[PDB]
């Protein structure tokens with residue numbers, strides 16, 4: 730129901746924190762981004778934030794779609810942690 734982009738900055742920075750390291754790359758793969766497209770975000774100061782801002786532009790970029798993507802890369806631990 731809720732668009733990712735509509736979440737308060739405070740929630741989005743929790744999401745971003747948990748997607749640190751290479752997790753954002755794994756997630757981006759699941760969201761349908763090609764390797765070189767992903768590599769293009771490494772030029773940003775905040776690659777995770779840049780990715781999700783781009784992804785979040787679509788109308789099907791809901792929190793639940795994001796959460797679904799995370800379960801699929803076997804990172805339900807992040808879903809559990811955010812739902813806590």
Ligand SMILES: O=C(O)c1cc(S)ccc1[N+](=O)[O-]
Nearest residue numbers: 742743745746749774775778
């Ligand atoms: O700690 C990070 O990995 C992080 C980095 C940048 S550039 C922006 C937001 C962040 N948050 O919020 O996690």
Ligand SMILES: O=C(O)c1cc(S)ccc1[N+](=O)[O-]
Nearest residue numbers: 736740741744792811812813
């Ligand atoms: O709306 C919420 O508080 C929220 C709930 C769940 S289950 C997961 C992530 C969330 N984030 O990130 O906002």
